[PDB]
Amino acid sequence: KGNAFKHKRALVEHIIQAKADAQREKALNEEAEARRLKNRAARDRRAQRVAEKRDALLKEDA
Amino acid sequence: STELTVQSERAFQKQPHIFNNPKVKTSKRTKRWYKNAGLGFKTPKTAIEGSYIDKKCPFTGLVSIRGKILTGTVVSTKMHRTIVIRRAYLHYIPKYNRYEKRHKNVPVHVSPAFRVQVGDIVTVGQCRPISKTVRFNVVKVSAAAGKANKQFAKF
Amino acid sequence: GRMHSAGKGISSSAIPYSRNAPAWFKLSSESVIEQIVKYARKGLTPSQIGVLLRDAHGVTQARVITGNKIMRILKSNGLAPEIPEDLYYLIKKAVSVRKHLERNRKDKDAKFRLILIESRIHRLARYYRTVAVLPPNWKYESATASALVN
Amino acid sequence: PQAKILSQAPTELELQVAQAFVELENSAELRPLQFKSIREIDVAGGKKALAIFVPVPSLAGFHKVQTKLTRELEKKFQDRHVIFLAERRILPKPSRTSRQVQKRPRSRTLTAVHDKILEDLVFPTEIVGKRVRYLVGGNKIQKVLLDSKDVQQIDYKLESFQAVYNKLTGKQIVFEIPS
Amino acid sequence: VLVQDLLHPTAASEARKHKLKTLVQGPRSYFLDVKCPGCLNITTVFSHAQTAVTCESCSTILCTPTGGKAKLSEGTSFRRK
Amino acid sequence: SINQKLALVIKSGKYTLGYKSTVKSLRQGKSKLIIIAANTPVLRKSELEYYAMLSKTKVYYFQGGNNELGTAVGKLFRVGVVSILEAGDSDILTTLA
Amino acid sequence: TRSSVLADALNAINNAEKTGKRQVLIRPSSKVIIKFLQVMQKHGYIGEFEYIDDHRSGKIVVQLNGRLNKCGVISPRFNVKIGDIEKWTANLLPARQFGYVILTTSAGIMDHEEARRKHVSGKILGFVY
């Protein structure tokens, strides 16, 4: 409704580029969320393993 | 990037004298030429693995970096395979024993081995003339962002 | 100094020398952190949280009792607002003055004060956009500041 | 369970200290609090001074315990002045030529570590004021002003603390009580 | 004048100064332990409180704000601690 | 005051906007409070008040129009009636009744 | 909005020296102030001085002796090659046989005689006499 697009071909190419950029963004954001959830799980596990080392691992062999 | 898919142009884009024989059934189907540009500039995996051609590239193309190496900030990305960098510096005036800020803008060719954005600092090297105004080519990038995308995500 | 007026007020708090204090204080760091979080759920800003802890309890200063500042505590517990409190209050004041200036077009003092306030907003917005707590492309527009005081 | 509480083998001094710890517990919540090293050093007059180094996350319980443990150690292991400290790591300041490593927090910077060493040499008298005289001979001296509260416990330890701070940090020091 | 100890001034000369203009600044304010006649619990109350502090047991008024020091209510037990 | 209260409810609690959803929640009995703009038509207001006196539900009359109520509950559109069906961390029910 | 804490310090010292006082309090403090005063102390122009540790920035109490005529500050701190210390010393010192220009080098803050001996140069800070 502005112009932005001399014709159908121009609009199609613009759609292609926009979709490609959006997909790049989506992939980056998704792998980032994956990394962060993975790190959070690991740093809950370490918390478990070290918080339950003071209690009943510090008594038997060593 | 660059969505040439690989062959957007009306001529066939290839590396010259790089011949992939359809007879020999080589188990790569990927014959490329790259070079070490030199001076400890790392040849990117995007260039080695990519499909682009870019004869003006310092890694897969025919130009050679020789002379000066400069640094600057990208203040434009609106051309195709070239940018404009700002090169800021201080000029001394002895009468006043003081300095004054000056800039020169410097157009640069950028390969599609680099994802360059306005604001990024970029190191460039002197090539032969490849346009009216361009004599330099991007050979290294340093993005001054840290991928600070989620800082905009606020809720 | 006073950025926009000519006052030279030195009115301020005098933080004491003892960074570890005050030797009569029970009710440990975890307790006061829990109190902070209850008040934030109850819908208060850091300044008012600090006031309430100070006056109704014995909490001289949260960085002293805990080792963290209140905004950090609230962020780590996930209660950080969308815009910082000082900017929020500025936007609110500007909204109020604009409303009043709609109802009262003959007030020139109000236009003047509104310009000053908006200048303050844009200065803080520059700062926050640089240090990246606000997004880039964030901009205060008077049209929808009601929908950004939100 | 005496070699338990050393965190390293040697030697006779630390062993005497650990068996003192054990005999003191047998009398309650001192078993989790283990130390690392010991430094016995001189005082200009008379006695010597024990520096008991500790991992810093134990300082809470140690500080809860110190009075009712330092008293017993002063009693039993006589001819000495006991004091506790936390082994804090000092990381060096990076040079311009230096290749980058992490940010080197101010907890690990030098000045903060010395201030904390002082805050722990002193115990619960709560430093109120530091002053630094610069003497015309290019010299420096530090006044550290203590509170009148609980100074009765350490009014006889000042010279030993001075010598200790000199031996660890290498800089001169003096204390004062306002009245 | 022309000679004096700026490091060791008199407490009389230092207490009348502004809190910030002393040699080392610090607050002239304080905290109170307060009990109303009804209950026997202690409530910690800041001298310059800014709020109508309540006793949590008996939901009553203890101190009302003013421009400086809070005005404590009718006769109550108040310490300086 | 009521604005800050509503702004807390809108992020902590459970609300619905609009006449149809109020009437639905109010037939269902889920609603505790309804806030009604000033410029709403009197017949709509009366219908809501009557549904409320049947459901034994509280009614607040916002001193402000539907645009103002939209801004108060944090929306870029206008709303004539709000239904609060679970207040969260707020105080709005007891602050006034 | 202070811009040069050193400038404020040395104005205070100069004014008290004019007034005949024997001590000054200067706030805030700084490493540069401490080193500058250490130089003045080494060359005898002032006595001891005491750094009060408030937790903010610092105060300093300087005990001065009357031997000082002017301590001053060169703002901006120009860049000085070794060929130019002569020009600076002639311009802003009363005589050749006494007085000290203070400058900042990679070797440290010091007087221009020490800078000649160490064969270094740098940025100019002020002067003492």
Short mmCIF file of N, CA and C in Angstrom, two decimals, chain B residues 148 151-155, chain C residues 80-82 132-133 135:
data_model
loop_
_atom_site.label_atom_id
_atom_site.label_comp_id
_atom_site.label_asym_id
_atom_site.label_seq_id
_atom_site.Cartn_x
_atom_site.Cartn_y
_atom_site.Cartn_z
N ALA B 148 24.60 -9.63 22.00
CA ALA B 148 23.75 -9.06 23.04
C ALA B 148 22.34 -8.87 22.47
N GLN B 151 19.42 -9.07 25.71
CA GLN B 151 19.28 -7.85 26.49
C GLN B 151 18.09 -7.02 26.02
N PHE B 152 17.71 -7.13 24.74
CA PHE B 152 16.50 -6.49 24.26
C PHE B 152 15.25 -7.22 24.75
N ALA B 153 15.36 -8.52 25.00
CA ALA B 153 14.24 -9.27 25.57
C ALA B 153 14.08 -8.84 27.02
N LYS B 154 13.02 -8.07 27.27
CA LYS B 154 12.71 -7.55 28.59
C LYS B 154 11.24 -7.81 28.88
N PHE B 155 10.95 -8.36 30.05
CA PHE B 155 9.57 -8.58 30.47
C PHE B 155 9.43 -8.55 31.99
N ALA C 80 12.16 -8.60 38.38
CA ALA C 80 12.66 -7.36 37.85
C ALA C 80 11.64 -6.76 36.87
N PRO C 81 11.27 -5.49 37.01
CA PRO C 81 10.31 -4.92 36.07
C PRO C 81 10.89 -4.71 34.69
N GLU C 82 10.03 -4.24 33.80
CA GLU C 82 10.36 -4.12 32.38
C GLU C 82 11.14 -2.86 32.08
N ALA C 132 22.56 -1.31 28.31
CA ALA C 132 21.82 -2.49 27.88
C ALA C 132 20.99 -3.10 28.99
N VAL C 133 20.08 -2.32 29.55
CA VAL C 133 18.99 -2.85 30.36
C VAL C 133 17.69 -2.53 29.64
N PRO C 135 16.22 -2.09 25.62
CA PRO C 135 16.64 -2.47 24.28
C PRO C 135 17.12 -1.26 23.52
#
